[PDB]
């Protein structure tokens, strides 16, 4: 049988390393109550410009237009890999968003953002995004949903909201405010990671069984949809920063990142790179993720 | 606007009880890597009689057969009730009995029944329940009522007795105990949906009680207790939304409730 198949028995597992992913989250464990943001709002009142309010603002309003909502997709992985193992996969990323989604709720909450939050498609840049990952995730066919599965991944989980990320820890390292902020986007960056991850395997598992389904057509249709998310973060990357240019973070070092990142996760799936940024250009954010693990703990 | 309609925006949350259960679930998080079954093991093969033995390997395997599996009820309850605080609560049940599933898969590899859990459907008594449990489901009132409760409380009595009377399988006790307690929050998450939308069983489970001892009673515990402590929570459970028992014929089984409490922390 193949990976879209459905077996009855719950064990022996035919994918095993689902366990490793969802472990992982088992051990990353967290919920957003064990963190009090008083401070944080403290030194958002007091030690921050409006060039820098309005940053981490639009940086919280555009990760929560994607990730405050009812996910599915994680949630509903088993009805395409009829398998124990990615129900249960499924139900642990499933859970994670929901805690995900309480997190930013909190913090739109306790920043006074919720007005802004409903009317969020008011904003022209939000719209364009939500139009264009409405066609990227349209077949949300096993084939037309393994590329989905692709923009998945490489999007929702890699790279359409690790910029915005970066963002937000830029704060603490370089000005030290926003702590406990970025105490949760660095416990969310790893399980964003892990979500990541366990899409990469599946990909490869569909590949290792499936080689015929990498065609030339769907390789160009993945790149030359890529190509247009980077055209759309980059507008948002704008309207992030629409009050100027703030000291912590550049916007140019965000999208070279941003490029980064994904040529990253097709390598991992082996798909050719596109990109493919110099290390004078990806290294001004090599501190993500030694401050992704110095908020961690 | 009921319960069933589809409101699109995340919050404000209609049924913002729906954090309590969720936060219950989160607060007694927990994994069966946590535990080492090594003094279990050994208690097992040396201190416990084949009618022992028996009673604990039928109990696992009565729990297992409906919770070892894919339990596809809470994960979807979105698509039955279209609010962003169900679909966290389904998510936070769903996941929570994955951890269960892979708890119980622990507990037949630690004590070596996985053969006995693939032939399991061999059992009469096994099929009985697999055809009962098959037309009833075609919901979520016998779906509170069974799978969440009293359809694996008497089982979690007779393993948990061994560690009160005896003090063996103390870390098996530790997983039942968890798990009772995530049960109940089960329970009482399916009871709060039917209070917001407000004897074929005890036959059923006295064989499977008959079958669980089928080498001879214990003295742990007792078959005819079982099925006063299992009509106490029925009713019990049915307050919140039949079988009027005596208190000193239901009290022989009240501590387990205190049990359940001195094998969590
Ligand atoms: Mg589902
Ligand atoms: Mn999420
Ligand atoms: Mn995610
Ligand atoms: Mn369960
Ligand atoms: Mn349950």
């Not at 309480?102 to 995004?129: C, M, Q």
């Not at 990227?136 to 989905?148: E, G």
Request: glycine share 4%; proline share 2%; hydrophobic share 45%.
């Amino acid at each position: 049988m193949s990976i879209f198949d459905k077996r009855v028995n719950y064990k022996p597992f035919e994918y095993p390393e689902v366990l490793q992913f969802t472990e992982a989250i088992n051990k990353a464990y967290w919920v957003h109550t064990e963190v009090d943001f008083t401070a944080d709002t403290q030194d958002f009142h007091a030690h921050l410009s409006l060039a820098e309010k309005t940053a981490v603002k639009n940086s919280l309003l555009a990760i929560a237009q994607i990730e405050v909502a009812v996910k599915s997709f994680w949630g509903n992985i088993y009805e395409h890999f009829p398998k124990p193992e990615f129900n249960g996969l499924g139900s642990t990323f499933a859970e994670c968003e929901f805690r995900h989604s309480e997190a930013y709720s909190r913090l739109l909450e306790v920043l006074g953002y919720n007005d802004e939050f409903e009317k969020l498609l008011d904003v022209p840049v939000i719209r364009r995004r939500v139009d264009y990952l409405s066609n990227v995730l349209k077949d949300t066919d096993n084939r037309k949903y393994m590329v989905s599965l692709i923009l998945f991944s490489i999007l929702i989980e890699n790279v359409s909201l690790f910029s915005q990320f970066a963002i937000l820890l830029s704060f603490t390292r370089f000005k030290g405010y926003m702590k406990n902020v970025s105490n949760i986007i660095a416990w969310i960056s790893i399980d964003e990671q892990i979500h990541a991850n366990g899409g990469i395997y599946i990909i490869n598992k569909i590949r290792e069984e499936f080689p015929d389904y990498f065609d030339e057509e769907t390789l160009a249709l993945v790149r030359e949809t890529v190509k247009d998310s980077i055209a759309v973060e980059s507008d948002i990357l704008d309207w992030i920063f629409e009050e100027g240019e703030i000291e912590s973070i550049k916007k140019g070092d965000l999208v070279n990142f941003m490029k980064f990142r994904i040529d990253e996760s097709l390598k991992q799936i082996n798909i050719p790179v596109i990109f493919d940024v110099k290390v004078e250009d990806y290294k001004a954010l090599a501190w993500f993720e030694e401050e992704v693990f110095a908020n961690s703990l």
